[PDB]
C-alpha cells in the first residue's frame, strides 16, 4: 500500500536500482567476465522479505 517507512522506501528503491541487466561492455573484459546477471529479481518470481 501507500503507507511506508522511509527506511523501507530507501530499501525498495535500492532493490529497484539493483534490478538491472549487466552492461553490454562487461563481457568483453579480457579475463572472461560475467555473461548475464545472475542476481536479478522479478516481482512475480521471488518476493523481498523486508
Amino acid at each position: 500500500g501507500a503507507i511506508k517507512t522511509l527506511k523501507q522506501k530507501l530499501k525498495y528503491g535500492k532493490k529497484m536500482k539493483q534490478n538491472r541487466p549487466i552492461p553490454y561492455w562487461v563481457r568483453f573484459k579480457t579475463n572472461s567476465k560475467q555473461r548475464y546477471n545472475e542476481k536479478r529479481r522479478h516481482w512475480r518470481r521471488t518476493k523481498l522479505k523486508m
Partner: protein
C-alpha cells in the same frame, strides 16, 4: 481448514528488519530480534550452531578498521620473518644522534 484455505489469511508480519543484523528476524510485538537479540547489548550466538557463527564472524563484512590493523600486523610479521627487530634509537645512541643533530642544525 488447515492448508490452502488458511494460507490465505496469512498476511501480517511477526518479524521485520532488524537494525543490527539487517535480517527480517526482529519480532514486532515483543521487540526482540530472533537472530541477534537486538535490545540486549551482547550479540546472540550459541555454540550449537557453527554455521550461524560463520555467517556473522569478523571477515564477512567491510572490516573497515580491522583489515587495516591486520595489514599493519602483516607488515610487521613479514619484517620479523626477514630479521628480528632492531630499535633505531636506544640508550647507547640517543646522545650521539642528538648532539650530531645539534651540531648539524647549528
Amino acid at each position: 481448514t488447515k492448508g490452502t484455505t488458511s494460507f490465505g489469511k496469512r498476511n501480517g508480519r511477526t518479524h521485520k528488519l532488524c537494525k543490527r543484523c539487517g535480517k527480517r528476524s526482529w519480532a514486532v510485538q515483543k521487540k526482540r530480534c530472533a537472530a541477534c537479540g537486538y535490545p540486549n547489548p551482547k550479540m546472540r550466538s550459541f555454540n550449537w550452531s557453527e554455521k550461524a557463527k560463520r555467517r556473522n564472524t569478523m571477515g564477512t563484512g567491510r572490516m573497515r578498521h580491522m583489515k587495516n590493523v591486520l595489514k599493519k600486523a602483516a607488515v610487521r610479521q613479514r619484517q620479523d620473518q626477514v630479521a628480528p627487530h632492531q630499535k633505531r634509537k636506544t640508550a647507547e645512541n640517543r646522545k650521539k644522534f642528538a648532539l650530531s643533530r645539534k651540531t648539524k642544525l647549528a
